[PDB]
Amino acid sequence: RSVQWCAVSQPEATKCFQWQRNMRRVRGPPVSCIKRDSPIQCIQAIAENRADAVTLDGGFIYEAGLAPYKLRPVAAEVYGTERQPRTHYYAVAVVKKGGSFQLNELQGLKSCHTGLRRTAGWNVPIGTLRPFLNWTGPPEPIEAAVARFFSASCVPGADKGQFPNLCRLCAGTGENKCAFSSQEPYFSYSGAFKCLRDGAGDVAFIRESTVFEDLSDEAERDEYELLCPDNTRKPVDKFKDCHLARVPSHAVVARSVNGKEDAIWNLLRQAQEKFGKDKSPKFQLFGSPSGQKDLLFKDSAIGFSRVPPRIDSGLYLGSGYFTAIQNLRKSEEEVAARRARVVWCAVGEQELRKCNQWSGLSEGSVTCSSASTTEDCIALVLKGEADAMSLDGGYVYTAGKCGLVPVLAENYKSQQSSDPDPNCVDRPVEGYLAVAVVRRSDTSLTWNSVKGKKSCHTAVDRTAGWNIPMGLLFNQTGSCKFDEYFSQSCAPGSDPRSNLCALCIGDEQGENKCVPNSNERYYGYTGAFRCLAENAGDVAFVKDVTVLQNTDGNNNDAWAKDLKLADFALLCLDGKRKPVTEARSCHLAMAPNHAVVSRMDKVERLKQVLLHQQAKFGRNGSDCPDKFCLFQSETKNLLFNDNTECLARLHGKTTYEKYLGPQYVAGITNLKKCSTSPLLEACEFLRK
Amino acid sequence: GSSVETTPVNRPAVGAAMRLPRRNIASYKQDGTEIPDKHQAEEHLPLKEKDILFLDGTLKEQADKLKKKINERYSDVRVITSKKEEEKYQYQFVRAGYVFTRAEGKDNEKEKTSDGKEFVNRFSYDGFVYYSGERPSQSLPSAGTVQYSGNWQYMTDAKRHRTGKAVSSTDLGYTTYYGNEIGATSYEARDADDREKHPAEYTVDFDNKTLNGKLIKNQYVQNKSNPNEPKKPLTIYDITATLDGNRFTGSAKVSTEVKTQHADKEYLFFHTDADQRLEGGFFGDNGEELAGRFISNDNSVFGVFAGKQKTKPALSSGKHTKILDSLKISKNPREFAISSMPDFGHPDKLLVEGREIPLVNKEQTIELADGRKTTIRTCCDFLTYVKIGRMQTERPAAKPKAQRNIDLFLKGIRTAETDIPKTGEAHYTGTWEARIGKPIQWDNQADKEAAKAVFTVDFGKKSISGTLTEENGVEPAFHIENGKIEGNGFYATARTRENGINLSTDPKTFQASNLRVEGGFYGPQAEELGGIIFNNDGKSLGITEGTENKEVKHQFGVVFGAKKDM
Ligand SMILES: [Fe+3]
């Protein structure tokens, strides 16, 4: 019907009512109002379909993202000016200019906070002050340690009955004293600064822009300083060097599914146009009457920026801030163990099982996280819930475009083998050959007429399976409709209702068809080749070593036993066909090796664990096959390609552009101009 | 190859060093003046993990290499060493010191444009902080906790504005310019006690294989007239580590006292921990001394440190248990004597010139620094916790035509003394290598397909015996009897048959009369076996290598190793 906005306070209902009338006056998108008592009540109301949207601080975006609520940000507040907009702000500590203490030597002082569990108010300052709190750890609430650290403080929303020290510095004129509302004069960014301006406390944990919006001109702002994490005091203007954290802007959150995302953005877009900054005389959408702080939106905000649908609470907050909130309810011992361990990300249940075997033998250095698809696993390491994974070159482009870096490369046989290699770790990589495989009986099959046939692919967006073949066909047609290059295909990761999935066969029960992991029997290098071997498709796009390892009894599976290498040929870029052995002269393109990717803050530790684990469980390891093997073992093509000899160093090619190569990266982004890639659109928003 | 199982952070070493960083203080870009508002080209220069130097050789030899690096950069500048500071510790196998120069009369490193504006300007100071070790420990204290005492050095990054308002480095506790234009170093600490600036303490628990330690800075004391004015120790780092072989890895964490009390003086340089970025090892034949290093998470501090030591109740039944075996018996041969070969306890890895090189099946060649090239051939795939073989070092400078000299070695990781079976009998079978000597020479390759080298020992009785066949039976071979295994290892006697077969020309017989055999058990529950046969005195492996209890010489050598089956 309309967009139901949720108001967490009695005055926020009044402004929202003012909002409803003005939209009807200009005949704009309608907006109704629902009244609740707290942001968490608004989050619960949205999950019940009794409301649709609410503006939320980053500390409550995290709460909205937890089960069973799972609300996602859809529009981020924009601060600054139209010509210099910003979707992030800085958590700062503001103090009087009289020196005498720094960010560490503030025990026994008086603090002003915007509110419990708020980003600059609570989460950032308490997180950085934790080593000085002498906190016993969870489940005992950290408020007790804080209430014992400072002499007294004003923390709006804190439990007044259990931690009265956290409320003694507020002035609510009655039972509105420690209120999470504008009825407390020391409440918001602006409110907590008043607690410092009045002299109630000696430190205010607020925004970097409160002083500029609350102090008239550059005469009283010189009375206040900033506390930098390096324990130095710097002027207010240098908040970019003297901030406690850089955090994302407050955002509008809604339901993940059936959340009225289109209507919410349409409403906010037109309200910004009509009642934004320096606009229609009455009813500015930002800022509102006497003694009121940030009614439904941040005061002196200029507009909104739309958030791509893929972004959840974890991705929106960023790994640094997301784990900081999580660490506030993990024990100090738990925090250290997480930082010292490598959390591998598995794709599918089968890869999860293999990781669980590995974790018990890693001596506490490897644990496991699981995601349904590779892009999901990339999001997990992006959020910090995961650390590393081995990616095909095409996925390395995605992870690199999202900020992840390659760490080690899957080394294959060299261009001069001569032995099982002892210095494999230092042997430079040489790539692998992507080929088009056809049954030798079909002699009319040439590369000049490959289109319109039935194709088998490893998975969408992969190098040998998708990027190299489709890029060659796209370079000669200009057609973005890849579902029409072939009549039918099995391209795992596509639309299951599309004909790009019409050839996939799913698991042994026939379900989970076209899913891009090991559950789909036509997934990957060997699955695509099997799709050709069972006459499902006419041409398979795999690497050349796959055909060699799955023919002539090299694979004892029923679908691969009795398969002869002589029954297969390769489509060269001539129209001529050649045997699989001559792939060095009948390949499509060189493909960069699969590589392990991670965040920059984990590269050194990841190198330590992997270089030690593959010494124990790698090929020709001490405990392989007696205990466990990372590479080809009782498990095939899980977490690592079976043709991997070792994880080798990158020789300086530590970025996705340097590693993948200039020409291969240029080719991928050319194809990506046709597609949407919700993960890429999410990272484009984030890296901005 | 190279060291393929470690990063530069956790890599084992007999010596490691870091060079003094020097940030670019130039105020000009390569074309025109600095667009940043009165900034410099490089205001923050952290340390680099790839700039960690790894050393090799004796304690003196490692120091001279660092001195050579400084002397290569500047013509005739005086080089200052830490030999005066190290005197009060009397280290016998370790060093935690520094080498540096002040570059008297030498201008800064400069690069200018054609017009004249300079875009590179680095202070001509130069220096190192390093740790060095000799004789990596082959045996360690059996049990208990052992107190270690010593010192430590450090080197920080370069940051222009530590306090934000351009203060002097002397106010922050260092000699002028140190910490601002170059890294802050322990050898230019200004606010420390001159009597002992950077003492270090350690507590090693050999029961639980854990290490604890404190890196301490003695703060400045005003009055130097009283020789016993109380010290003012301040803990900077808390050290935790877990033992592995004769080495250990762990973390360094800044003490909270530094964070809360010295927030504006010491916390400016010691503010980030080194989590899983600390490593070290024990040096001396019996773990008398230790040395190690660390680099913090953000590459802000690189520290080095050193330490020295201050029946059947438990595992402490002699105070010393052999941890590993690494020895060699030095074409014509070389000096026929045994000598401990430096090693960290990795049988399939050989420590040559500071770097660990992996050992493959057979017949690999590695090249040395001086120019000599040595080719090694070690034993076989079935042995995993003990390796045998031989190597010959050659200097290929005599240009002919088409086509320490030859040494036999033994390497393995021992079993714990509370891990050897005390009940039953077991059978081992392996291979063996042997060389004759200076007269008519006879080499015997270790094969595992031509040499039998069978063994048997009753752990309940401790009566190890065995034979190592050459052609058929034990007639052209040796016999080993009178076992009497002892704790971690064993010692026996070597006899042959009436003669030995080498090839009526001249049947080359070999005779042996109750020669000395010594060896040990390697790995898990006595998985494998290994030993040597030699004759100079009661001086071999097995018993903690004290080389006593005799006394004649000869020139012959044979090394063996075997694995068990049933
Ligand atoms: Fe906030």
Author numbering:
A (entry chain B): 5 to 692
B (entry chain A): 34 to 343, 352 to 371, 378 to 450, 528 to 627, 632 to 678, 698 to 713
Text from the published report:
Lactoferrin-binding protein B (LbpB) is a lipoprotein present on the surface of Neisseria that has been postulated to serve dual functions during pathogenesis in both iron acquisition from lactoferrin (Lf), and in providing protection against the cationic antimicrobial peptide lactoferricin (Lfcn). Here, we present the structures of LbpB from N. meningitidis and N. gonorrhoeae in complex with human holo-Lf, forming a 1:1 complex and confirmed by size-exclusion chromatography small-angle X-ray scattering. LbpB consists of N- and C-lobes with the N-lobe interacting extensively with the C-lobe of Lf. Our studies provide the molecular details for how LbpB serves to capture and preserve Lf in an iron-bound state for delivery to the membrane transporter LbpA for iron piracy, and as an antimicrobial peptide sink to evade host immune defenses.
Data were collected at the GM/CA ID-D beamline at the Advanced Photon Source and the structure of the NmLbpB–Lf complex solved to 2.85 Å resolution using molecular replacement in space group P43212. One complex was observed in the structure containing one molecule of Lf (consisting of ordered N- and C-lobes) and one molecule of NmLbpB (consisting of an ordered N-lobe, but partially ordered C-lobe). The overall structure of the NmLbpB–Lf complex has an overall L-shape. The N-lobe of NmLbpB is composed of residues 1–342 forming two domains, an N-terminal handle domain (residues 45–173) and an eight-stranded β-barrel domain (residues 174–342). The C-lobe of NmLbpB is composed of residues 359–718 and found largely disordered in the crystal structure as evident from higher B-factors for this region compared to the rest of the structure. Importantly, the C-lobe of LbpB contains several long anionic loops, however, none of these were observed in the electron density likely due to their flexibility. The interaction of NmLbpB with Lf is mediated exclusively through the N-lobe of NmLbpB with the C-lobe of Lf. This interface consists of regions along both the C1 and C2 domains of Lf including residues D630, S637, T639, K640 (C1 domain) and E512, R525, E538, N539, D561 (C2 domain). Interacting simultaneously with the C1 and C2 domains of Lf, the N-lobe of NmLbpB has an extended interaction interface that includes residues N154, R193, S201, D204, N213, R223, K230, Y253, Q255, and S258. In the NmLbpB–Lf complex, the interaction interface is stabilized by extensive hydrogen bonding and salt bridge interactions encompassing a buried surface area of ~1760.8 Å2.
